[PDB]
């Protein structure tokens, strides 16, 4: 590929590359309103 890497294709097609209070209220409200 055109930015100094080489891609290769494995026979099982893996492409590889060789390169170079309120807090508890908030938590319980996001619980109870979901």
């Amino acid at each position: 590929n055109y930015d100094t890497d080489f891609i290769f294709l494995d026979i099982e097609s893996t492409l590889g590359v060789v390169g170079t209070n309120s807090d508890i209220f908030a938590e319980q409200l996001h619980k109870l309103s979901s």
Partner: protein, 329 residues
């Protein structure tokens, strides 16, 4: 006009409680003002003609006190979804304003009566009424620590009240119309603003003298002050926000707004701001994106320009791009 009948922030501006009508019955909902920290369940008023006349965040199981129009203060926890306790006066008169200091709730009545309740005891402590104050629609506790002396009551004309003597100790020239905001700024000043006028005035609570007059350029709906008196952000009738930066300094007798913020969409449609919140360097504005669902925005208000126009993305003619189909159908 706005569907949101009543709305108020918690202190620190993290949640917004708002009462809107839903097909002839009031409903009270709470939204977080930033999701990065929907809430689809409301308190439903079950009567078609019972409605909320005022609301106040308590400060620690978090709750709202909703002053109704049948002589009741409902106390409603928000994590659960029930009114936990129903304060009641002896009457059927609608209640015009409430406040609390610590655990000591105070409220005013349409028969110009003062009631005191104790949130720690769930009891009506005091009931009285004072002469020459006869059209009351606001009260505000002047803070002096755990002592809850000196109420500050408005009827178009603010009056300072000592509660040990149940009598009036100062009389402020109010407005020509009923007072709609009445809030204590420092330990020596309070701001007030009336219905249908664009003039706040800050009075000296020790002498009676008006320090200054603050001039919005549209009729004021709500106000918020930062906790150290250094900034006051009012929101007006035309959906704009106006920030008075450092209003309590020496534009000498009457001060204009320093900054003005309005929101337009990508189209040109101007959405209205209702009920913003300001603090140190942080300003949270609210609007309704769809018909009744509140959306919020945080702003560093000190570094924006004066005439600031927030842009929001809002659906106006956008082709329904389905994710399971390319653009050619």
């Amino acid at each position: 006009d706005s569907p949101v009948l009543q709305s108020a922030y918690d202190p620190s501006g993290q949640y917004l409680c708002y009462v809107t009508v839903a097909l002839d019955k009031q409903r009270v909902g709470v939204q977080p003002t930033q999701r990065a920290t929907w809430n689809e369940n409301f308190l439903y008023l079950e009567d078609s003609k019972l409605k909320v006349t005022c609301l106040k965040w308590v400060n620690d199981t978090v709750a709202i006190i909703l002053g109704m129009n049948n002589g009741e203060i409902w106390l409603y926890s928000v994590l659960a979804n029930e009114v936990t306790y129903k304060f009641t006066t002896g009457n059927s008169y609608e209640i015009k304003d409430i406040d609390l200091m610590g655990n000591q709730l105070w409220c005013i009545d349409s028969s110009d009566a003062f009631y005191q309740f104790d949130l720690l005891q769930f009891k009506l402590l005091q009931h009285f009424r004072i002469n020459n104050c006869v059209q009351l629609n606001k009260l505000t506790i002047v803070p002096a620590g755990d002592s809850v002396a000196q109420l500050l009551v408005a009827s178009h004309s603010i009056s300072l009240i000592d509660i040990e003597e149940k009598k009036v100790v100062m009389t402020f020239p109010g407005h020509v119309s009923p007072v709609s905001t009445l809030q204590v700024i420092t330990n020596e000043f309070f701001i007030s603003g009336a219905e249908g006028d664009r003039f706040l005035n800050v009075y000296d609570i020790h002498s009676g003298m008006t320090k200054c007059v603050l001039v919005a350029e549209s009729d004021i709906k709500e106000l918020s002050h930062s906790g150290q008196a250094d900034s006051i952000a009012v929101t007006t009738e035309d959906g704009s926000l106006e920030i008075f930066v450092d209003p309590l300094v020496s534009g000498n007798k009457s001060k204009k707004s320093s900054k003005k913020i309005q929101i337009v969409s990508k189209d040109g449609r101007k959405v209205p701001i209702y009920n913003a919140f300001i603090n140190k360097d942080l300003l949270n504005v609210s609007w309704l994106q769809n018909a009744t669902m509140p959306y919020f925005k945080n702003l560093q208000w000190r570094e924006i320009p004066n005439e600031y126009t927030v842009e929001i993305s809002l659906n106006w003619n956008n082709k329904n791009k389905s994710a399971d189909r390319d653009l050619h159908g």
